[PDB]
Design a protein around this nucleic acid. Sequence first.
RNA 1: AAACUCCAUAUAUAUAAUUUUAAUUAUAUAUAAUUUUAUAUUAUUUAUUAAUAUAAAGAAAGGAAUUAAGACAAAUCAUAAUGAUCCUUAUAAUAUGGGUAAUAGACGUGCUAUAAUAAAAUGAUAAUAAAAUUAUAUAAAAUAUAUUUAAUUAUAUUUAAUUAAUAAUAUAAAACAUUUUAAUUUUUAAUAUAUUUUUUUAUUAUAUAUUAAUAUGAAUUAUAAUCUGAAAUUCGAUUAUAUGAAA
Lengths: 55, 79, 98, 119, 124, 105, 402, 126
Amino acid sequence: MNVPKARLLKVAELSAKIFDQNFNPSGIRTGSKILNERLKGPSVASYYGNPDILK
Amino acid sequence: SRSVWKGPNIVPLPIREAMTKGTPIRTNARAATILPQFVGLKFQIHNGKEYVPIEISEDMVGHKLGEFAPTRKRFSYTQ
Amino acid sequence: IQALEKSLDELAPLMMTKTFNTGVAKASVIPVPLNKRQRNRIAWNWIVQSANQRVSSDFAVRLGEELTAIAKGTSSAFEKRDQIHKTAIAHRAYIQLK
Amino acid sequence: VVHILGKGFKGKEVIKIALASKFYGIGKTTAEKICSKLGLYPWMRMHQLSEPQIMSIASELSTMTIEGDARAIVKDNIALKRKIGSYSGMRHTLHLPVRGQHTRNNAKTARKLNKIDRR
Amino acid sequence: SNNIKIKTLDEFGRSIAVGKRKSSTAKVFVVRGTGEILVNGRQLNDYFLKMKDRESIMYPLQVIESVGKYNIFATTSGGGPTGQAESIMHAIAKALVVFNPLLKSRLHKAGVLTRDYRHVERKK
Amino acid sequence: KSLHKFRILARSRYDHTTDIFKMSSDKFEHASQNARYLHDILQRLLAESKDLTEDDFSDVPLDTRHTIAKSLRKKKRDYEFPEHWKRPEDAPKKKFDIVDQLLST
Amino acid sequence: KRVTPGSLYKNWTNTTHTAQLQQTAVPLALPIFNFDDISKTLNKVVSYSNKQYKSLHHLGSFKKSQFNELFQKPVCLVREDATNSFLKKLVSHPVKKFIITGEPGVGKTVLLSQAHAYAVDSKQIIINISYPELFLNGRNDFSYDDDLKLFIQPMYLKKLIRKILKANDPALLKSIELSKDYKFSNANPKNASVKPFVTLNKTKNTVLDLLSVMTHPHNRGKLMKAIIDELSVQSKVPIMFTVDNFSKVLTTAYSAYRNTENKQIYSLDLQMGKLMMDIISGETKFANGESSTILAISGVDRTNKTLPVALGKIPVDPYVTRYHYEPKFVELLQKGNVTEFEVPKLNKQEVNELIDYYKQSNVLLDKDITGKKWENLIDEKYFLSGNGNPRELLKSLVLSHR
Amino acid sequence: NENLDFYSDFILRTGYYLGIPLTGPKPLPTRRERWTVIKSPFVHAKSKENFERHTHKRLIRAWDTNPEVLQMLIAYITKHSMAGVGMKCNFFQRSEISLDLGSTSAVGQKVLELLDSPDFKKHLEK
RNA sequence: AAACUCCAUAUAUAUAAUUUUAAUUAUAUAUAAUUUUAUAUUAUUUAUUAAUAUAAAGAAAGGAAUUAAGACAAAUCAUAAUGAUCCUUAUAAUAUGGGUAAUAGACGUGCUAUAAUAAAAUGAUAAUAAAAUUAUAUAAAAUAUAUUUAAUUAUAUUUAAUUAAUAAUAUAAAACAUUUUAAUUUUUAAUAUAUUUUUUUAUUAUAUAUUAAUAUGAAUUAUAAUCUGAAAUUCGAUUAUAUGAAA
Ligand SMILES: Nc1ncnc2c1ncn2[C@@H]1O[C@H](COP(=O)(O)OP(=O)(O)OP(=O)(O)O)[C@@H](O)[C@H]1O
Ligand SMILES: [K+]
Ligand SMILES: [K+]
Ligand SMILES: [K+]
Ligand SMILES: [K+]
Ligand SMILES: [K+]
Ligand SMILES: [K+]
Ligand SMILES: [K+]
Ligand SMILES: [K+]
Ligand SMILES: [K+]
Ligand SMILES: [Mg+2]
Ligand SMILES: [Mg+2]
Ligand SMILES: [Mg+2]
Ligand SMILES: [Mg+2]
Ligand SMILES: [Mg+2]
Ligand SMILES: [Mg+2]
Ligand SMILES: [Mg+2]
Ligand SMILES: [Mg+2]
Ligand SMILES: [Mg+2]
Ligand SMILES: [Mg+2]
Ligand SMILES: [Mg+2]
Ligand SMILES: [Mg+2]
């Protein structure tokens, strides 16, 4: 808490760089969440079973 | 209430023809947000059965077209 | 504690008349004996009702005052006991004894 | 009894609570700021106030939107809804719920209070 | 053959017993001492705020009149204060029988050696 | 000094209590790819920690708030039997059994 | 009205404290507390002297929830590991700055009352702050003083100054002649309209005169600074400054008061907070070498890392939020070299003495006297009290009807 | 549990001959899943039937073994697996800090394509 | 049918290199009770007996499932499935919007409340649980804003660990302690007073109205912002300021 914010920001920025993380000090909404969400299409589209069944 | 940071709910509408010809805009997009450009233009807004004619004023900007085309009839009892 | 048990033993009625719906005719008011657990309930409810007429906001204080007055002889619930015992003495013949 | 801007207060009432209770438009947070601005300690009561301090409260209260002014803002916002013909305006005119509440049952409070000239 | 081996004090003179009540469990270490008790490393008055819970823990020692003759190191987990206090009570009673097996009958008669079976029942 | 800078830059990935630095990755589709990715990050973190020419972050103390939060979610049984309570003289003493003593000879 | 002159209308805790229920207690003849003859009273229950009772009542040494109403007057067990041990350190240690700790109800307040009793006997001037919450809860007036640059609290200061005057021997106060001339505004309703100010000349007036000055509320902060300065410059009489429930100060850095910007006022911006911490930190030095500063914590207050760090019991964690760690208080406490004295729990022999006194006071139930062996009772009550807690011992004896 | 325990016993026998120190099978907490249904097809929501499924778990640990021998164990026990038994294997490989040769998302690509299309470039023009 | 069972409980053995730790546990197997014995009393079909108590041994005190018959031609053709009969450019199929959310009265079932044996704050070396969930995810810590020293609450930024006896949802809550609490002049304040000092006593001021709605209650409503979604108008959730009904 007594650690100057400038010092703690330098650690955050360098740490984010090493760990390939997005450093957004301002907090602007960037949409990064949308880019990271998983694709659920394959699971959703198999709900009713494999269509290539022997008939 | 749509978050302000997302912007208006913009829908495809024929506004150019209504601004160069004065024709009414018939639409079912009741969710559409009345943008400041729409002011002065004439809209025919679906209510599920009919198309209600409404002209947009400056006190309607920000609201949505559906708000001005009631979908139900006033209730009455067989007293 | 000894004061509480003495007060409960003096205030609780020994017997109480109860109406039994025996027969299509009018019910009978027959005196019935009470056990110690049933006697304590009757006397405690009288104490609580008397306590809740006092001025203190705290129930513990009102209860404490009520219990102190009863341990010192003064209580309005002794009238209730006398009226329950009078009724039973009147209906002494209604008892069955078999 | 202490009188501030016509409102009457019992002497024992705490100032920060009394102000948010009798004055339309002033709540708990707003009342605390007024007392902090006038140097009144958090739990000071009305009977303690002097006449110079009673006048200071009235001055600060007269530089705010309260009572009629605050009530007029609500009445004018409701009137605008009716003027533009919005669905919400009709609900106010019909004395019906304006926030999506069901009407098959209940809806008693909306029937008593919902009106263009809302109190 | 039988499945019971005589219980005896351990290398440090301690009698170890486990007790259960509701969802709570307690493992106590009883040794000869002067009446010192520790519950999960904390003072009895700190861990158990209710005096009735403290009185429950002391009852088995009060039956054999040995409240000042033993040191108890009780460890308890699960359930609430009542389950833990009575689980410790049950475990102390079972641990006291090793010091004098002639007092088991008195402990059984007081009811401290009977495992309380009552638990929350899903409504049926 | 480099060990301190390493621990500061790891942030939530370092547990001071256990001294363990743990990082996982499932970003790629194959485990081999993910293994290389973690290895490459490890080399990058070590290089920065061993380059104290500009900043060593010695003024910055280690932050353990993440570890404290984790500890509050696990039950800690950190109490042991008092040593001054032990009574070794009350333990049972092995008895003399002639049969077992005679069966061994 | 529903309330009559003698009706018990308050809650239970206030009724027991205020209803004068000790009147029916039986008078017992106990030895008197005297540290100079502790050998004759060690490990025995003693009453205080008549001179000590008068001073300790004016200081607020006796508090509610101490079962004082069970006995004719409050009594204390002179303990070897708590009372005798602490008082010997107070007479020998050169710094004489202590903070009394221990588990809730262990007897920290009673120990402070025994230190007040010692000071009364040993001709010392006692300044006690019994309940610091009274100047931090925002329930009395406050004003900003430009000359002091502090928020003064006139209502509280008036009560505190009277306590210092009524609790201490007038002779000691009269001995301290004033070192400077002082002028204050006159608020005495007799000559206030005739004399604009009251002057206190040096070498003529004493600190007793200074403690009797009736001034306007806005000049009462300057009267508290003069009193403390006069008592800290004189070397004749030792000054014992005490604060009970000091944990409240350590855990309430920001008072309930708000400035003109609706910002809560830091406790060190109040004169009471600044004065208290100036004496503890050592900024305000007392000329007499027997002056002491005894602080005591209370279990009714929340705990955090402030006090443990100040006492050296745990390492400093810099990332602890300010609401759980106040580094400024730690600096002040460590600058004053405050040392901890942990009040130990009672041993079984001390429990025996207390229960033997309770039997003679007729406070024990009939279930603990008839049909129970004395040794069994002591063992049971030592177990049910947590192995020594005095407060849990009393509750097990007089407040456990199950 | 029956096939689970039998198969676990077989793994221990396979490991012994392969020279693999093995511990277990350690029983892990059984997971219980529950479903409550209404017995009637249409109405009568007052009579409800209970159903459950228990997942039985066992942990077998391998120690002080070379990777190649460990793979032989997994291959053999896979070849002779029992019905209705599943198997997860966590392998732990101790390595050196620095190694030799080591040990773009679809959405991001489409965003770049979309931001270059005329429907977007026509606005980005400054 | 009952029992024999299964669960719970007690105990024993096995398993865990006791850092997947809860060994005070996990879960496989086995054992145990439908308890047993002695004595006195009262009844008996009086004997090798029941009801009772007393003593002794014991951890032992609770549950589930367990099938046959018939009826209401009771519900369901709207979980799906069958006959008959009807529609086949429409009674089938798709899209956009609307409705299922309407409102006089009435009924069922709930929630919140109408204050002092009860509500509100605060409690960081962190009082004390169980059962569940996390690959169509659970989201830590930190930072920023509301917003104030900080905490708290909400959201944003960022996305650590864990696909799990490992990490996360999640420091359970009540309890308990302290403080506060309208009606209540049972209060507060100014002086003086005390051997009740967080307090007592005295004298002044502290309101009027008032069978009544407060610092109880939180319906209704204004404005601003936020969350999910392609979309929140009919018709969603949350927050802030203000509003503060009935009871
Ligand atoms: N030496 C003693 N002789 C007699 N009674 C004592 C003694 N010490 C403590 N007590 C009693 O124990 C109880 C608690 O005492 P005290 O109030 O001093 O404790 P405390 O630790 O200061 O409490 P808290 O943590 O609440 O501030 C009281 O009833 C007190 O009278
Ligand atoms: K208001
Ligand atoms: K509706
Ligand atoms: K209804
Ligand atoms: K373990
Ligand atoms: K709809
Ligand atoms: K309430
Ligand atoms: K929990
Ligand atoms: K009201
Ligand atoms: K909407
Ligand atoms: Mg990750
Ligand atoms: Mg947290
Ligand atoms: Mg104290
Ligand atoms: Mg039908
Ligand atoms: Mg419906
Ligand atoms: Mg905890
Ligand atoms: Mg967080
Ligand atoms: Mg976990
Ligand atoms: Mg907690
Ligand atoms: Mg609470
Ligand atoms: Mg309220
Ligand atoms: Mg009414």
